Amino acid sequence: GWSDTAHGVGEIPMKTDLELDFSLPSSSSYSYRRKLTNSIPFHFQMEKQVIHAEIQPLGHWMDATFNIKTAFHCYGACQKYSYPWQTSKCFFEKDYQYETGCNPGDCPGCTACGVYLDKLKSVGKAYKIISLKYTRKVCIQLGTEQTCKHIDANDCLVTPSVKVCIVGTVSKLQPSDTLLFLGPLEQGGIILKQWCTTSCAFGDPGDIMSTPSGMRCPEHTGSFRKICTTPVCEYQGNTISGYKRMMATKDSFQSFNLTEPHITTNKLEWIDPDGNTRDHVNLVLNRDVSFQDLSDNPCKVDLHTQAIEGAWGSGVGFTLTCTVGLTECPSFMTSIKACDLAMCYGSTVTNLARGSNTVKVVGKGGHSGSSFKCCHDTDCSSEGLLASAPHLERVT
Amino acid sequence: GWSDTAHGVGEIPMKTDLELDFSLPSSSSYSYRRKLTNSIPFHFQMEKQVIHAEIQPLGHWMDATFNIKTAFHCYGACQKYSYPWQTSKCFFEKDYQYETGCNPGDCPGCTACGVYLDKLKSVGKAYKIISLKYTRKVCIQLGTEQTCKHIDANDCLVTPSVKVCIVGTVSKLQPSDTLLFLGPLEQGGIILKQWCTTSCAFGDPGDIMSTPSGMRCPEHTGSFRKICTTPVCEYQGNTISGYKRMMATKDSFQSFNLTEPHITTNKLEWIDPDGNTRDHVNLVLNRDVSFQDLSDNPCKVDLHTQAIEGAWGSGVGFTLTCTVGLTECPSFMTSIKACDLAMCYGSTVTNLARGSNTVKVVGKGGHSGSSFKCCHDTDCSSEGLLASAPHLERVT
Amino acid sequence: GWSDTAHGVGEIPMKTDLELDFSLPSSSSYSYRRKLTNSIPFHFQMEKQVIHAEIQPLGHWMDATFNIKTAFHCYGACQKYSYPWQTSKCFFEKDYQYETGCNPGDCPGCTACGVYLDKLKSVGKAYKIISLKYTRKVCIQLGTEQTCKHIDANDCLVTPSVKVCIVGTVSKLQPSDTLLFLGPLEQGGIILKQWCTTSCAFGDPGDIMSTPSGMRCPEHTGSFRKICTTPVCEYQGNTISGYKRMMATKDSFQSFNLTEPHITTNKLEWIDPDGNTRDHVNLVLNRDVSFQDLSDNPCKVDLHTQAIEGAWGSGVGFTLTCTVGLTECPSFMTSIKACDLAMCYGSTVTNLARGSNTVKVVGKGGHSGSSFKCCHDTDCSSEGLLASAPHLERVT
Ligand SMILES: *[C@@H]1O[C@H](CO)[C@@H](O[C@@H]2O[C@H](CO)[C@@H](O[C@@H]3O[C@H](CO[C@H]4O[C@H](CO)[C@@H](O)[C@H](O)[C@@H]4O)[C@@H](O)[C@H](O)[C@@H]3O)[C@H](O)[C@H]2NC(C)=O)[C@H](O)[C@H]1NC(C)=O
Ligand SMILES: *[C@@H]1O[C@H](CO)[C@@H](O[C@@H]2O[C@H](CO)[C@@H](O[C@@H]3O[C@H](CO[C@H]4O[C@H](CO)[C@@H](O)[C@H](O)[C@@H]4O)[C@@H](O)[C@H](O)[C@@H]3O)[C@H](O)[C@H]2NC(C)=O)[C@H](O)[C@H]1NC(C)=O
Ligand SMILES: *[C@@H]1O[C@H](CO)[C@@H](O[C@@H]2O[C@H](CO)[C@@H](O[C@@H]3O[C@H](CO[C@H]4O[C@H](CO)[C@@H](O)[C@H](O)[C@@H]4O)[C@@H](O)[C@H](O)[C@@H]3O)[C@H](O)[C@H]2NC(C)=O)[C@H](O)[C@H]1NC(C)=O
């Protein structure tokens, strides 16, 4: 039956006017100009590849000094007086109250132990990658008709007589990677496969995180001990911060650079300047009547967003229930996408029958204000649906 | 010399009857029907891509409550009486016996500390990915001759006059990834790059694991302390379970969905419903006498499984020593595979000489009952060999 | 304008003499011989793929036994006497001096605790992967003119009349992976995604590391306690070494084998014997005057290395400032590379104008003696620059 999922052409090579087959750096453009005989001008322009990363913003990674202080007062109870470290942003406290052999002179009590972090200094911003999308802008002008589109990696553009396909194993960054920028985005980031998430301890990568909703403080896994002169508190645990431990071995981690980067709340956009990342590009110009666009179809698709579940800004994603009506075709195998005002975040291939169908699409990314709509090609539903906030909370 | 490792054709494009070049979603089929002139019917059917993951079954991940109880009895010795927590599936015990200042009234002893987990609830099944294989079923009918085969990704099918090649960077899942299904497989899983393996502590991802051979209990890394009234036990360590720590930040991890999934002891089979994963498909129909199958060869290959070492169900794999006899050809460069009744798990390219050769193939996956045989194309040895059980034991 | 970044050709398929399109194992060669009519001999030889991994050498991973000893002497002070474990390569010490109820008989003192590791045995060498590069040697002989080059994956070779392109999702190993060889390289390695780097504790993968600059000892995160007869030291912490914990579950990790491997200080070179890794190969022989090499250009490029910053042997890399003069062309979009005597480590695509330009290239890898030069094609600067030593130190 009919289907538009195949993005490509059927051709007779004998009838092909021109074929291009080359490898191009991701960071390179390409321009080709030849006059086609009848003279007909012909222009093929491919732009630099653009990386689109849906990111979770993690805030500022913090450096700090580890401190422990004892406070022994002979007065009654431990809670009745408070202690100097309790003004710190992050402190962990243990109180040895009404226990014993340990009384210093003049005291016939409370022994307050306190570990806290001060000299807090931001060392860079961190982002966790939800999804990655690689696109290139391609413009084709055959005579007086121009066609421009943004082509995804491993996808093809089909015009009445030109087919342009890209194929590239471009994938240095991975989803759920953690990007750390010690400076402005322009100066590049560091990829960290290890970054604390479910069990952030002091000294872990990402231990102290200054977020917009306040500070996020690491647990101290060491053990306390009361020494018995006035008692002194002792802590057996990690003293050195996660930042200092990473910088000491910093050259162990993978960097990645960014040219002209643009950033929003949930998305990072740049061009990778590494000229070694190459994809394969194939262009075929074939003006014969037998040059068939494989995606041609007389089918019509009506879209309505039925329901939504799941979260925005999540590597788990959201699930979008679509009501897809099909007319003018007995069946039609196609792709239905989840898109908002900005762009799309996921697609599902279904086999549609005459009449109404129900189609569920899993999207990944988006923000609080994204109104995700069911989309086909450039046709989306009239209405969109907001998703739930993502669960990204330390348990502490 | 001769060689069948190249899966493809040499053609004259002028003599090509038809060429198809398109990108297709992994989750999409494709059908093409054109009448070839002489009329000759021609049908090209490509099916959805099927993901084959050799998995290590890890059992049920468990949620639990952390408990600590003290038991002080004045009677002699600590071992002589046992304690209530010792019926729990997972408990860790420390006994302060015959030590000191700490005696409560009426006692002129044993102080039993016990941390244990109860309210154990299964929260999902977990699997570690050994290997990944992406296949598509392709059927070609030129006139009255039909050819169907399952093509691996980045491989080609060659018929007397048709060449079909697939090229796809399809690889979202990675080997040694950990898949967690909070529900039935149908409802999808979560990818976890961090999952405890060599040092499972309480609070780690995968801390409490209910396996078929019984329970697998996490270590508690905290420290004990006897407080001195009857003595009270104190524990400085993580109280919150790994499950609760992950759910609190669940939206941080990558999901993956599965359509019509099928599961065995060591293998998970499904179709990825994400329509954004696209591979490149190229078909060439060329009926000219100069259309040469590059893998054509008059060579004959005899197979015998010599020995085996290594383990089934292991990402390290097993090594299969093959005795490969070659006749009717001076040399022959080919691929020798390790396959069982179900399918194949690895292949090795060698350069064979006239007579007997020894060829070692590394396979990954399989199960206890798999009888791995040396195979060439569809020809395998008569006899197979069982492999060793995999070493997948916590040290505890 | 002009550009040589596109490695490929523009052709008329009708005028094509011969086209090859096949998939080949990475571990396979290929040879094709046909006589071209006028007879003209034609030879196309493709060699096995070669993996080039820039590695950071980590030294010998060590197995050990965990020991704890108490030393109580009644004499004055703890420092005045030293203790037997202090000859061990790795020991961690805690001294309970001048504290209290605990005095054994004949003593009216010092209680020395000592945890140490002995029976140290090397269990294998470990390497962290900086970067990966996949190359194949390809030779083309059309009549009396031969052209040989080493082609990178996803790149094309262009001769006056032949175009050879490779496209392959070949990427089992990943950058910043950790390779462990329990034996000689020939016998294969194990990939470890978890390998301690910023917080190496006893029991972590890679806990005890014998490096050329001496030993690297793990921290012991447990807690000490003085028991009160002469006092006994107690340690609550992990007793079992990282090696023993991995071997107990060894079959959980991914292996990779190596044929004829060659190793230097900063680079590992081999051929992957897995015959399932396949890339796509396309050859086009087209001797028509319209067969245009897309990289043809009359431009000339002068090179001078301006400055360098960053480190050799680092997954973060070094930044190379190049002075690139352009003559004979108004503009020229090209690739400028960072290479030393051995090979290249990175490239940057720029748009050059008439006259002098400044171009910054990020390289990854190299060694202490590498003199990195700015390069274009096979033309490099006369002078090179040394980079800084990488920061790869445990904080301890
Ligand atoms: C591609 O990305 C790379 C990583 O994102 C970029 O590397 C960065 O390049 C900058 C610019 O040179 C370096 O900054 C330099 O730092 C050194 C040393 O300073 C360090 O030490 C002091 C003292 O402890 C400390 O206070 C600093 O904060 C630093 O930690 C200075 O001497 C220089 O003058 C300059 O400030 C970065 O260090 C470096 N990043 C890393 C991780 O090494 C690279 O430049 C990018 N290249 C391009 C072309 O975009
Ligand atoms: C693709 O895969 C995704 C992940 O595998 C799928 O996401 C899952 O979708 C189901 C169906 O809606 C969700 O189940 C819902 O859960 C919410 C909330 O329940 C949670 O909280 C309660 C209370 O704490 C707890 O008891 C539960 O166990 C849950 O933890 C309910 O309100 C709903 O009625 C429904 O039960 C899953 O939560 C969700 N998974 C995740 C990880 O979020 C997705 O549906 C798949 N899509 C397709 C098309 O296959
Ligand atoms: C591809 O790579 C694989 C991994 O690098 C290779 O697997 C290795 O193959 C060798 C050769 O057979 C095995 O060595 C064998 O070990 C067993 C058991 O010995 C173990 O136990 C003892 C006692 O505890 C201990 O002392 C040893 O050190 C071992 O830990 C012996 O019975 C055999 O005689 C032989 O020595 C390796 O064990 C195995 N590696 C792993 C991780 O299992 C594989 O051979 C490679 N194949 C090719 C074709 O290159």
mmCIF file with all atom_site columns, C-alpha atoms in Angstrom, chain A residues 180-258:
data_model
loop_
_atom_site.group_PDB
_atom_site.id
_atom_site.type_symbol
_atom_site.label_atom_id
_atom_site.label_alt_id
_atom_site.label_comp_id
_atom_site.label_asym_id
_atom_site.label_entity_id
_atom_site.label_seq_id
_atom_site.pdbx_PDB_ins_code
_atom_site.Cartn_x
_atom_site.Cartn_y
_atom_site.Cartn_z
_atom_site.occupancy
_atom_site.B_iso_or_equiv
_atom_site.pdbx_formal_charge
_atom_site.auth_seq_id
_atom_site.auth_comp_id
_atom_site.auth_asym_id
_atom_site.auth_atom_id
_atom_site.pdbx_PDB_model_num
ATOM 1  C CA . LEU A 1 180 ? 30.678 20.506 32.770 1.00 0.00 ? 180 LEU A CA 1
ATOM 2  C CA . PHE A 1 181 ? 31.664 23.994 31.587 1.00 0.00 ? 181 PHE A CA 1
ATOM 3  C CA . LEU A 1 182 ? 34.419 25.479 33.739 1.00 0.00 ? 182 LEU A CA 1
ATOM 4  C CA . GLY A 1 183 ? 33.997 28.687 31.736 1.00 0.00 ? 183 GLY A CA 1
ATOM 5  C CA . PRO A 1 184 ? 31.701 30.334 29.215 1.00 0.00 ? 184 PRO A CA 1
ATOM 6  C CA . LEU A 1 185 ? 30.180 27.825 26.804 1.00 0.00 ? 185 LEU A CA 1
ATOM 7  C CA . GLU A 1 186 ? 32.478 29.147 24.042 1.00 0.00 ? 186 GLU A CA 1
ATOM 8  C CA . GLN A 1 187 ? 35.490 27.725 25.908 1.00 0.00 ? 187 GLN A CA 1
ATOM 9  C CA . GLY A 1 188 ? 34.210 24.136 25.797 1.00 0.00 ? 188 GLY A CA 1
ATOM 10 C CA . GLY A 1 189 ? 33.058 21.506 28.248 1.00 0.00 ? 189 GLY A CA 1
ATOM 11 C CA . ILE A 1 190 ? 34.159 18.226 29.803 1.00 0.00 ? 190 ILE A CA 1
ATOM 12 C CA . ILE A 1 191 ? 32.243 14.964 29.454 1.00 0.00 ? 191 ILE A CA 1
ATOM 13 C CA . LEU A 1 192 ? 31.826 13.037 32.703 1.00 0.00 ? 192 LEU A CA 1
ATOM 14 C CA . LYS A 1 193 ? 30.494 9.490  32.646 1.00 0.00 ? 193 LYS A CA 1
ATOM 15 C CA . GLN A 1 194 ? 30.595 9.477  36.454 1.00 0.00 ? 194 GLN A CA 1
ATOM 16 C CA . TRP A 1 195 ? 28.508 12.234 38.034 1.00 0.00 ? 195 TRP A CA 1
ATOM 17 C CA . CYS A 1 196 ? 26.675 11.652 41.302 1.00 0.00 ? 196 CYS A CA 1
ATOM 18 C CA . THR A 1 197 ? 22.895 11.383 40.996 1.00 0.00 ? 197 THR A CA 1
ATOM 19 C CA . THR A 1 198 ? 21.279 8.964  43.453 1.00 0.00 ? 198 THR A CA 1
ATOM 20 C CA . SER A 1 199 ? 24.017 8.979  46.144 1.00 0.00 ? 199 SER A CA 1
ATOM 21 C CA . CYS A 1 200 ? 25.967 12.249 46.196 1.00 0.00 ? 200 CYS A CA 1
ATOM 22 C CA . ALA A 1 201 ? 28.681 12.124 48.856 1.00 0.00 ? 201 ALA A CA 1
ATOM 23 C CA . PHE A 1 202 ? 31.292 14.767 49.612 1.00 0.00 ? 202 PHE A CA 1
ATOM 24 C CA . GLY A 1 203 ? 34.137 14.099 47.188 1.00 0.00 ? 203 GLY A CA 1
ATOM 25 C CA . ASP A 1 204 ? 31.925 12.606 44.487 1.00 0.00 ? 204 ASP A CA 1
ATOM 26 C CA . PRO A 1 205 ? 31.885 14.296 41.066 1.00 0.00 ? 205 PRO A CA 1
ATOM 27 C CA . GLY A 1 206 ? 29.120 16.831 41.414 1.00 0.00 ? 206 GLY A CA 1
ATOM 28 C CA . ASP A 1 207 ? 29.015 16.712 45.208 1.00 0.00 ? 207 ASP A CA 1
ATOM 29 C CA . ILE A 1 208 ? 28.056 20.339 45.995 1.00 0.00 ? 208 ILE A CA 1
ATOM 30 C CA . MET A 1 209 ? 25.509 21.754 43.546 1.00 0.00 ? 209 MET A CA 1
ATOM 31 C CA . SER A 1 210 ? 24.140 25.313 43.701 1.00 0.00 ? 210 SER A CA 1
ATOM 32 C CA . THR A 1 211 ? 20.753 25.090 41.988 1.00 0.00 ? 211 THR A CA 1
ATOM 33 C CA . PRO A 1 212 ? 18.141 27.798 41.353 1.00 0.00 ? 212 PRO A CA 1
ATOM 34 C CA . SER A 1 213 ? 15.887 26.335 44.081 1.00 0.00 ? 213 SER A CA 1
ATOM 35 C CA . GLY A 1 214 ? 18.755 26.769 46.581 1.00 0.00 ? 214 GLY A CA 1
ATOM 36 C CA . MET A 1 215 ? 21.800 24.719 47.491 1.00 0.00 ? 215 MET A CA 1
ATOM 37 C CA . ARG A 1 216 ? 22.111 20.932 47.199 1.00 0.00 ? 216 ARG A CA 1
ATOM 38 C CA . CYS A 1 217 ? 24.461 19.599 49.909 1.00 0.00 ? 217 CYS A CA 1
ATOM 39 C CA . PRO A 1 218 ? 26.328 16.276 49.883 1.00 0.00 ? 218 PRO A CA 1
ATOM 40 C CA . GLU A 1 219 ? 26.045 13.636 52.553 1.00 0.00 ? 219 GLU A CA 1
ATOM 41 C CA . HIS A 1 220 ? 29.121 12.943 54.670 1.00 0.00 ? 220 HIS A CA 1
ATOM 42 C CA . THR A 1 221 ? 29.502 9.160  54.913 1.00 0.00 ? 221 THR A CA 1
ATOM 43 C CA . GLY A 1 222 ? 32.247 9.176  57.537 1.00 0.00 ? 222 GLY A CA 1
ATOM 44 C CA . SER A 1 223 ? 31.777 8.395  61.201 1.00 0.00 ? 223 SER A CA 1
ATOM 45 C CA . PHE A 1 224 ? 31.762 10.607 64.273 1.00 0.00 ? 224 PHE A CA 1
ATOM 46 C CA . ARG A 1 225 ? 33.595 9.975  67.534 1.00 0.00 ? 225 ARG A CA 1
ATOM 47 C CA . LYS A 1 226 ? 33.806 11.897 70.812 1.00 0.00 ? 226 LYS A CA 1
ATOM 48 C CA . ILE A 1 227 ? 37.363 12.043 72.151 1.00 0.00 ? 227 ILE A CA 1
ATOM 49 C CA . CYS A 1 228 ? 38.003 12.298 75.877 1.00 0.00 ? 228 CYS A CA 1
ATOM 50 C CA . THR A 1 229 ? 40.441 18.357 79.096 1.00 0.00 ? 229 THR A CA 1
ATOM 51 C CA . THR A 1 230 ? 37.405 19.422 77.091 1.00 0.00 ? 230 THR A CA 1
ATOM 52 C CA . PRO A 1 231 ? 36.168 16.797 74.608 1.00 0.00 ? 231 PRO A CA 1
ATOM 53 C CA . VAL A 1 232 ? 37.189 17.049 70.952 1.00 0.00 ? 232 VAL A CA 1
ATOM 54 C CA . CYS A 1 233 ? 35.105 15.832 68.021 1.00 0.00 ? 233 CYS A CA 1
ATOM 55 C CA . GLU A 1 234 ? 36.737 13.503 65.498 1.00 0.00 ? 234 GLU A CA 1
ATOM 56 C CA . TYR A 1 235 ? 35.570 12.635 61.975 1.00 0.00 ? 235 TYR A CA 1
ATOM 57 C CA . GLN A 1 236 ? 36.910 9.720  59.922 1.00 0.00 ? 236 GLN A CA 1
ATOM 58 C CA . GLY A 1 237 ? 35.868 10.507 56.364 1.00 0.00 ? 237 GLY A CA 1
ATOM 59 C CA . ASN A 1 238 ? 36.723 12.212 53.108 1.00 0.00 ? 238 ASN A CA 1
ATOM 60 C CA . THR A 1 239 ? 38.058 15.746 53.577 1.00 0.00 ? 239 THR A CA 1
ATOM 61 C CA . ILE A 1 240 ? 38.833 16.653 49.951 1.00 0.00 ? 240 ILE A CA 1
ATOM 62 C CA . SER A 1 241 ? 36.110 18.038 47.687 1.00 0.00 ? 241 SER A CA 1
ATOM 63 C CA . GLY A 1 242 ? 34.963 16.425 44.461 1.00 0.00 ? 242 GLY A CA 1
ATOM 64 C CA . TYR A 1 243 ? 36.228 19.369 42.409 1.00 0.00 ? 243 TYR A CA 1
ATOM 65 C CA . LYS A 1 244 ? 39.741 19.142 43.859 1.00 0.00 ? 244 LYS A CA 1
ATOM 66 C CA . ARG A 1 245 ? 39.782 15.389 43.226 1.00 0.00 ? 245 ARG A CA 1
ATOM 67 C CA . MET A 1 246 ? 38.815 15.866 39.567 1.00 0.00 ? 246 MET A CA 1
ATOM 68 C CA . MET A 1 247 ? 41.234 18.720 38.821 1.00 0.00 ? 247 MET A CA 1
ATOM 69 C CA . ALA A 1 248 ? 44.056 16.586 40.230 1.00 0.00 ? 248 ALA A CA 1
ATOM 70 C CA . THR A 1 249 ? 43.338 14.063 37.429 1.00 0.00 ? 249 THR A CA 1
ATOM 71 C CA . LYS A 1 250 ? 41.517 16.412 35.046 1.00 0.00 ? 250 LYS A CA 1
ATOM 72 C CA . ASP A 1 251 ? 43.382 15.287 31.909 1.00 0.00 ? 251 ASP A CA 1
ATOM 73 C CA . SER A 1 252 ? 41.639 11.911 32.275 1.00 0.00 ? 252 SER A CA 1
ATOM 74 C CA . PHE A 1 253 ? 38.279 13.167 30.969 1.00 0.00 ? 253 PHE A CA 1
ATOM 75 C CA . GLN A 1 254 ? 36.994 13.864 27.475 1.00 0.00 ? 254 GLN A CA 1
ATOM 76 C CA . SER A 1 255 ? 36.573 17.439 26.337 1.00 0.00 ? 255 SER A CA 1
ATOM 77 C CA . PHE A 1 256 ? 34.336 18.729 23.554 1.00 0.00 ? 256 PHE A CA 1
ATOM 78 C CA . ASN A 1 257 ? 34.398 22.194 22.037 1.00 0.00 ? 257 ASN A CA 1
ATOM 79 C CA . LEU A 1 258 ? 31.560 24.379 20.791 1.00 0.00 ? 258 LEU A CA 1
#
